Symmetry: C2
Subunit: 166 residues, 2 copies
C-alpha cells in the first residue's frame, strides 16, 4: 500500500526517451534487454522456490531486478522486488493479496480484458513447524506471482507507447 499507483514513472522514462533523438533505437533497446533479463530472473527465482530454497539467492536476484526496473521507471516492479528482498532477509513478515495491490492502480482500466491470474505458479511449499523458512518462502512465492503480473502490466503499457508487442 506504499506501492506506487502508476505502472510507469514518466519523469524517469521521458529522460531515457530524450536520448532517442540521437540514437533512434536507444530506449527500445534497453526495454528489450530488460524484458529478457526479467524472464531469466523469474525462472531463476522459481527454481530456488522449487529446489534449494536459498533465501540469500532470492535476496540477490531481487536486488538485481530492483535496480534494473527502477532505472527504467518501472516502479511497481521495483517495489515488489524490494519486498522479495526484505522477505529473503527476514526483515518483513507479510505480503498483501493481489486484490489489494491491483486496487492501488491509478488507471484501473488496464486490467479489463486480462486474466490477472494467468501467469501464477502453484505455491508448492509445504508448511513446516520445524523449518524456520517455510513462511518466508511462501510469502516470496506470492510476491513472485505478483511480480509476474506487474511485469505483464508494464509490457502492455510499454507496447502501447512503442506501438509494437514487446
Amino acid at each position: 500500500s506504499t506501492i506506487p499507483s502508476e505502472i510507469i514513472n514518466w519523469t524517469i522514462l521521458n529522460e531515457i526517451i530524450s536520448m532517442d533523438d540521437d540514437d533512434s533505437d536507444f530506449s527500445k533497446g534497453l526495454i528489450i534487454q530488460f524484458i529478457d533479463q526479467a524472464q531469466t530472473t523469474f525462472a531463476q527465482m522459481q527454481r530456488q522456490l522449487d529446489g534449494e530454497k536459498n533465501l540469500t539467492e532470492l535476496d540477490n536476484l531481487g536486488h538485481f531486478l530492483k535496480g534494473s526496473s527502477a532505472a527504467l521507471g518501472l516502479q511497481r516492479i521495483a517495489w515488489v522486488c524490494e519486498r522479495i528482498q526484505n522477505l529473503g532477509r527476514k526483515m518483513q513478515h507479510f505480503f498483501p493479496n493481489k486484490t489489494e495491490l491491483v486496487n492501488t492502480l491509478s488507471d484501473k482500466s488496464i486490467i479489463n480484458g486480462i486474466n490477472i491470474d494467468e501467469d501464477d505458479e502453484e505455491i508448492k511449499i509445504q508448511v513446516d513447524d520445524k523449518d524456520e523458512n517455510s513462511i518466508y518462502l511462501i510469502l516470496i512465492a506470492k510476491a513472485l506471482n505478483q511480480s509476474r503480473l506487474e511485469f505483464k502490466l508494464a509490457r502492455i503499457e510499454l507496447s502501447k507507447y512503442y506501438n509494437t508487442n514487446l
Copy 2:
C-alpha cells in the same frame, strides 16, 4: 552547446535514492558499481584507440556507458558518450574543445583547483591521408579525454553528497 549544464540530474537520481528507505545502501551500491564499470569501459576504449582502432567496438562501448550513466542521472557523461557513438558511426564530424564544454557548467567553483587536463591520455593516432577513419579516431580520442574529466567531476559531486570517497 547542447551539453547539460549540471553534472547531476537530481530529479532522476532522487528517484533512485527514494529506495534507500527499505534498503539503506541501495543507491550508493549502484554508484559504486557504475564507477567500476566506467573505469573498465574507459580502459577498453583506450585499448581500441591504441590497438585495432575498431570504430564499431567504440560505438558499442559508448552505447553501454550512455545507458548506465543516463539511468543514474549523470547527464554530462551520457552526452559525451552519445557523441562518441555518433562519431564512431560517422554521423558527426566534430567535437568541441575542453574549454567550451567546461564553460557551460552552471557552477564553475568545482573546477577551481583541478587541472582539467590531469587525466588526459596522449592522442597517438596519426593523421593518415589515406585512412578516412583517422579524423574520427582523433575526435573520439578527444571525446574520451572529456569523458574522463566529466567522470571525475561526477565523482566529486557524488562524494560530497554521500560524504565519503567514491
